[PDB]
Amino acid sequence: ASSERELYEAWVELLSWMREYAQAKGVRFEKEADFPDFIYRMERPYDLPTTIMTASLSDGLGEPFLLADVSPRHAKLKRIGLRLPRAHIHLHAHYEPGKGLVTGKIPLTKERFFALADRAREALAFA
Amino acid sequence: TLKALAQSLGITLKYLFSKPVTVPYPDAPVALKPRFHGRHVLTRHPNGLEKCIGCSLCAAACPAYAIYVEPAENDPENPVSAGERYAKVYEINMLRCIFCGLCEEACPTGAIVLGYDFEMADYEYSDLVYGKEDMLVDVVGTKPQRREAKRTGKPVKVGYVVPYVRPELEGFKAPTEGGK
Amino acid sequence: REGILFTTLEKLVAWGRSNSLWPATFGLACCAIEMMASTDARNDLARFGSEVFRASPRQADVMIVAGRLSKKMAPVMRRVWEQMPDPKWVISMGACASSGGMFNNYAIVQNVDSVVPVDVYVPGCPPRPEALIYAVMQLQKKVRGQAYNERGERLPPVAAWKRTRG
Amino acid sequence: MVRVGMRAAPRVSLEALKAALGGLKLSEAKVYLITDWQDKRDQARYALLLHTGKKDLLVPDAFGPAFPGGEEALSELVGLLLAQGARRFYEAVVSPGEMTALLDLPPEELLKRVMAIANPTDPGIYL
Amino acid sequence: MRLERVLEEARAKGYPIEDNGLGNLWVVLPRERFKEEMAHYKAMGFNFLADIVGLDYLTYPDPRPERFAVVYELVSLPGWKDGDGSRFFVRVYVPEEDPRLPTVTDLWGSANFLEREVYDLFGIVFEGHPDLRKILTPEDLEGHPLRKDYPLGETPTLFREGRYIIPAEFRAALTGKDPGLTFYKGGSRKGYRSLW
Amino acid sequence: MVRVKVNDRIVEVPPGTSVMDAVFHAGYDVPLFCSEKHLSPIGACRMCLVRIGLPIQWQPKLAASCVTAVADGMVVDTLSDVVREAQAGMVEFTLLNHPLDCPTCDKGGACELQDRTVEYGLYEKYPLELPVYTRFEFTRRHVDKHHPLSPFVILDRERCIHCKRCVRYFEEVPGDEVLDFIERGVHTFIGTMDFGLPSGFSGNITDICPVGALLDLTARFRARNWEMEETPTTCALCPV
Amino acid sequence: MTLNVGPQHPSTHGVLRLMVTLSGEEVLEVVPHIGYLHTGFEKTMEHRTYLQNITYTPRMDYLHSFAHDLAYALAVEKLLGAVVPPRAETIRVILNELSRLASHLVFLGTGLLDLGALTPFFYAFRERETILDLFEWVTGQRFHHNYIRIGGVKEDLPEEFVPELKKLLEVLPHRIDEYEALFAESPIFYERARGVGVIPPEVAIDLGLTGGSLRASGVNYDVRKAYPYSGYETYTFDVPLGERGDVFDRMLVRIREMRESVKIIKQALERLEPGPVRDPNPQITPPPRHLLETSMEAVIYHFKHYTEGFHPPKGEVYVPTESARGELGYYIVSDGGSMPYRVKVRAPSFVNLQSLPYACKGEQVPDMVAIIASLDPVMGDVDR
């Protein structure tokens, strides 16, 4: 259906939170990779709101501890994903209408993500 | 066949009194097709990002090896391309260029596309190496044309009109069939 | 007397020479066909003053190198330049002539400016007939003292005026 | 094939060539002024390869206005070659790195390559 | 019809018969039998001599009998007196040190220019020719351009500030002997043909 | 020495020879990712597969020619339809999650994956039917990108196809273990706890990585692989 | 008088030097001297990719280029086995006959102007202008068009192409008939060309004069008929011929050839049905531009195809075609590499030229220009 749209919109919203945390704890954030269907679209028209697909929070050593990704424009089984490297931790969120951004059945709010990234910073970050 | 001399005279007379067929360039704009092979242009996405990721594929598809593409690394704060790479130096030797259309064909980001300007006659060899800021879609005219518009004070008048610009030329502003 | 030595007379004769450009083609390759097409009933270089076409070189001021200049022809064409009246101009038409073009090999002169002093270069393959007209108008304003390079310099009226022939 | 003169010493190269040329008649000789960058002659450097057919003569890169006294030396050189009756003058455009190594290739390859790549040139560009 | 008779005449004396599945036929005659056999070939009804194509196999990946090989193209026009339409090639190997071959000028005048061209482009002299004069390359050009030991002689392409290109070191294309930029080439880049 | 037969050719070959070397020595070809010169072959990429007979006694499953020893009088088949279809399938599995970076990838033309893909992939299926390249229409694997492991080496964990070349080398050649995988499954990725990359011979992985994962930072974004003018010479920094 | 007719003078089109052994007003013998256009396609093609060479193929015969395009494409297809869609073959014959019309227009224009009246150059050439615009619609180029591909043609036709074609196809019959009415009923041309330019077929064959001036001598040999290659077998075709080889029969045969080409164009246009545009074999076709942002294999194959190209098998091949100057073909020796090991060209204008001293033997001195313009040489083909 059309929920996809808001999902990408919601996806953009997610990025904001990430950036905010960067200023809070003074930790390095990096834009990892942009959309291929936006680089390699030559004349084809493009309606998506933002051009960024993958980003991450890297520690002082540059090694990431938190990764966030969004599904491409034409792929099947679209989702938004989160991963903690080296910790065997994967989260798979959808956008359910009325509820909001939810990890499966459980809502994914700003506070939950802030806590998760703070835990990763305290635990996994080497320096 | 003595009649044939008089017939020849008669036909030359009929065609004498038929005035029209000719076009008075530069006073009349030449009608060019949309797919015409002209001066290269670099297109930008709607976001304003450049499309050239400096992948030097347009240079390989050159049978003269006339395209020089020095790449460079994007600055995330104020980027130029959409990926992690851009074209620091993008030059074309118009005296080496043969105007195939293979470079437009090989561009995967749609950055390099042939345009419509043909008025690129100039006096010096070293002045016929067109640069990036000499071919960006935002530029209006060819090198001698722009230089004459500056040393003259009169804006550039292109010597062509087209029915439209193709979709591959998104952004390229051109005179369209009489819409203006 | 070279079209010089009076403020009014030199502008007058520059006017005259500019609209009296007598093109002498030296048809070599597919460039030459696009020059001959610049004479048909769609786009004729027969207005600015270029109607008459004297095959003799003793009689024309503009020499248009239209095509690839193979080395075996390089002296012959060369001598036609030496056998021209002195107020003469040379245009290099097309890619093979202007540079080595795509034929970057043993056979072709990689810039015709080697054997003859070139006035104007006109890229294209072939350069559109309207582009060849553009180059002859370029040369028109060049011999008027109305032509400048990218570096700010004014270009002298006649190339082949500055060379020690030998 | 003989090699006279020295790199980047226009007057030394020119005087040595004066001495070595002698009374050799150049009616059928081939003069190869090797350079780089077709268009820009104001800073140009030149080697010289003179192929008589019976024996060859090599001058390294010491001519052209690129060196002090080099423009007047190239003018004197081309005037000398024309005085001795030469009509066939050639100019080869090589890569900068080729200019150096090409004088260190064996004589057969250097001479074959120069003869294959040489363009007929008007001595008026050097006078 | 006469091509089948050509094949039957050649096979009996031990002449190799080359064929690709595309409709092209080769009959390789030795040089001894070359002249008399091709005289007979004209006698067999070959009006038209299409081509004299010389080949220099110096850089060929696989070895060949001799470095040079000259191929004549014999045809019979279907619209003439009795036209079959049989067209085929005759290849004759020529050594590097023996660029000799009898002319078919006496047989066909068509080879007058054609053979001259191969003397220009290859070092191959055709014996008995009226005039073997350099056709295409300048009179003062030294050597034979189309043989692989003769350079193509490229010039660098020019740009703004010292940026230059030497095309031979710029080519992503490979030749047959060029190994490539990876450790090896297999599959499609060792030779590729679709099965219709 | 042991006699082997590849598809039309018979080769003498010393006994301890790998089937892969017998194919190439015989003049045929086979894909190659996991194995490398001077590195312990281990069947990992499963690209080196051939058909083997040792009597006509065809093997049930495809033989790994990179870790197979050769026996006297063995038949090796690299042209059977089954082998070609399987090799194309494995290429499909390998490129499945690749980041779509070829034009901007520093590896460019000298990338073994590119060459073996265009070599063996897309078996001739039987029409002039409109062909489909990839079946994978799902979301690809995305991990950390353009990460400098060291002032000389940059790391793209997406481009890694999980061969063993860098870790195999690191244990074998220098004897300096400063690299290995972290997790397993498809989540496996390369990492280190020794950050300075202390070994004095790390640079060679730059050349070995059949993808552009580990690239030379001092030669990142200068020119393309074919564009560079190569000068083969000898290094005089030290007397070796 | 061993007279030195220099290159390009006096106004000898197609740069060529002539040594006219000449006493009086006759012509003892003309010794031709060529090579002033030697560029080296056969040499430069040994160092260029198969796809890149399609940019080198039209430039030899710059008037009838699409026959060169077709010959090269067909030879490489046969060499690696490509599958041509039917619409690609239809469009290829359309473009081939169209460029043949443009070539023939130029030949007769140059001939009439070279000796005779200057007027009839323009009108024919005017129609040529019209034809040229058609190419600009589809190829974006006047000539030297890079539209053909290994599989077929580059991309599909615009909507606006066909109606302009119909416009020209309806105005052309009256036009060609007008040129023929002016010429065939030759008032003075008859006393100029009927006798001159002897073409006895025996020696014409002994020297290999294939280019359409052999059928002016009464030899019924057409490659489109004798060796059908691109579906010419699928067209209603009348083959013009001449009674005795002269300039009059040559010119009239070529005018009827123009009408036969217009008829073939109509015939192919009628049987035109929409479809694909080239052989999708990924080894031969780069992946479509839309899935460059979706599929990895697309990116790898697009990159590789446009940098390395494809490597056809080791072998030799050759294909015949009928161009405005005769039998045409490429003898291609491929070594299994991206660039051909050697490309030899059967230049029909090369073997057509051996018959000049014979043709202009004993003829007048002024007629030596007409007999050369009537032979229709394109020196881009000869010198090559």
Ligand code: SF4
């Ligand atoms: S159009 Fe020009 S730059 Fe583009 S590939 Fe052709 S010759 Fe090279």
Ligand code: SF4
């Ligand atoms: S113009 Fe296109 S093909 Fe050329 S370097 Fe830029 S993105 Fe690549």
Ligand code: SF4
């Ligand atoms: S620049 Fe192009 S049109 Fe002119 S002679 Fe060269 S190939 Fe022909």
Ligand code: SF4
């Ligand atoms: S590693 Fe190879 S296949 Fe992957 S993006 Fe780089 S060049 Fe392309």
Ligand code: SF4
């Ligand atoms: S990083 Fe490269 S060398 Fe190391 S395991 Fe991955 S593909 Fe192999």
Ligand code: FES
């Ligand atoms: S090659 Fe044997 S599995 Fe990698």
